[model samples]
Target: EVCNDEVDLYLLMDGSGSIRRHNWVNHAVPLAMKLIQQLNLNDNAIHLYASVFSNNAREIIRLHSDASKNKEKALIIIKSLLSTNLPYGKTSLTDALLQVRKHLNDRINRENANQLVVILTDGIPDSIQDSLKESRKLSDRGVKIAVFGIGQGINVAFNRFLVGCHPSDGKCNLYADSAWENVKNVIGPFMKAVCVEVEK
Candidate 1:
């Protein structure tokens, strides 16, 4: 066992109006639950955090909190999420990364249990350079960022533009066709496709 990894998984999902809400409700949310269910949960296991972003990072669950500790409850919360926020902007991928660093992420950063950021998005970021810059800052801080793109060119935009997602960084990126397939096509692979999970 890789003993030092008491890591927490913080999920950043895009909730802009452009991405169909039906797709978000039906495909994305439930699949996130299923994907997480693959892993054992709690402090000793891979604990989870939940967040969705539009123009900024809003918290649904938090690190080391009660709901964070309960995998079942965390699943339920994500199940109820929707893109109703429509959002004032496109996906704020950059802001989300920066917010995580300012939040519990840097505070919780540590040996083995180093921080991890998992981004779920369908549209290209409103600002690629901005997001790339934010991710690089996180990278320097010992946080490993993984990008999971769910849209047209799911592979291209994420692998090329999203910083910290390159395979050289331990295969830190993955993709599915679109929100239509949601996490299904990639979840099995994501459980460890990038070797993120020693096993899900």
Candidate 2:
């Protein structure tokens, strides 16, 4: 039996000035490439497509209609779009999440599928309280949110509110505090959790 009929992964990266230019070109771009390679996207199951947000939380890449079996194609799309600059303004998580929800609304239904929003950021929203409110709305719509705080910039209190988890939840909704060395290990389990859930 197929675990899920469809899956959509939207990646919202922080492109504000806080992100160093070198980090965007060297680190962030490669990290994205590796992630697409790691996903299981065979023809038998699990259709994967990606969109990005940046520059006042604009939708950088619209959701592709065609499901990709070719990981190479995804990688190329991400890389070719690497030159697309991020807006160097306030970090607008609320707007980004709203945009993601709008895109996924058409894709997610009461079918054999799952909707996921994977957010990678340093965790400093310009308006924490507003973002938290939006997050609750997204969760109510049955969207599972997984966050990765890249540095010490994550605000624990704000993240807790957005995740809707108690402190004792053992960091299920938030992953943080790692050197560049542990990128794979840090992201591996998160991706596995998503894939396994979809498989079920």
Candidate 3:
């Protein structure tokens, strides 16, 4: 199926020290590549952009206006991201969300595209309520928010909230508790599911 117009995707990656350095190349990069491949661009144009949040400088890759088919360039940007040597001090979900919102508001032509934000993280935010507030704002503005939680470090209760469902809603918002086990499965289905909704 083809999208009606362009789809704008922003991947907010967690670069905190908690994400092992070695895993950045093996797990993170591949997962990102898989996501790019799974996105059903069909005949419609798609623009993909990425950003990483760490204790230090928050890096924005390819900005928010780059084209998605530029996979080679996206791979290079992801590979270069491995150079950061910082250890995980804190998980700043709120900061990452703010940055993404600011960039989208400033760069995206909202009249012509669908906005989606995918956040990959291994843990829950230290400030859950604040992050949830930001998420609600994004959802209210028609931005689809998908959260991928990769391990036991994530709070199940909070993850449900982040996905815009009650803790007892019984509807999970595309989570992979074990990256080793569920990353590929979750990402492909998640992207396809979003594509179906975008058609509406």
Compared with the true structure, all predictions reach lDDT values of 0.64, 0.61, 0.67
Cα lDDT of model 2 by residue, 1-200, tens digit: 22233565566777676677766676666776666666655454444545444546755344543435456666776787566664256687778887766655665332445666677776487777777777778788777666766656667655655656674456453334344545656676656655565444
- Candidate 3 wrongly placed segments (more than 4 Å): 1-5, 40-44, 64-69, 173-176
lDDT at residue 166 of model 1 (Cα atoms): 42
The alpha-carbon deviation from the true structure for residue 113 of candidate 2, after best TM-score superposition, in angstroms, is 1.1
Local lDDT at 69 for model 3: 41
lDDT winner among the candidates?
A: 3
Tens-digit lDDT track of model 1 for 1-200: 22124666777877765576667667767666776666555676566677778767678887777677677888777766643454346677777777777765456533456466777777777777888888777778766666666756344545544543443334333433344664676666664643443222
Enumerate residue pairs that collide in model 2: none
Superposed on all Cα atoms, model 1 deviates from the true structure by an RMSD in Å of 4.0
Estimate the TM-score of every prediction: 0.79, 0.79, 0.82
Total clashes in model 2, counting residue pairs 3 or more apart in sequence or in different chains: 0
Instruction: Give me the displacement of residue 197 in model 3, in angstroms.
Output: 3.2
Candidate number that wins on TM-score, 1 or 3: 3
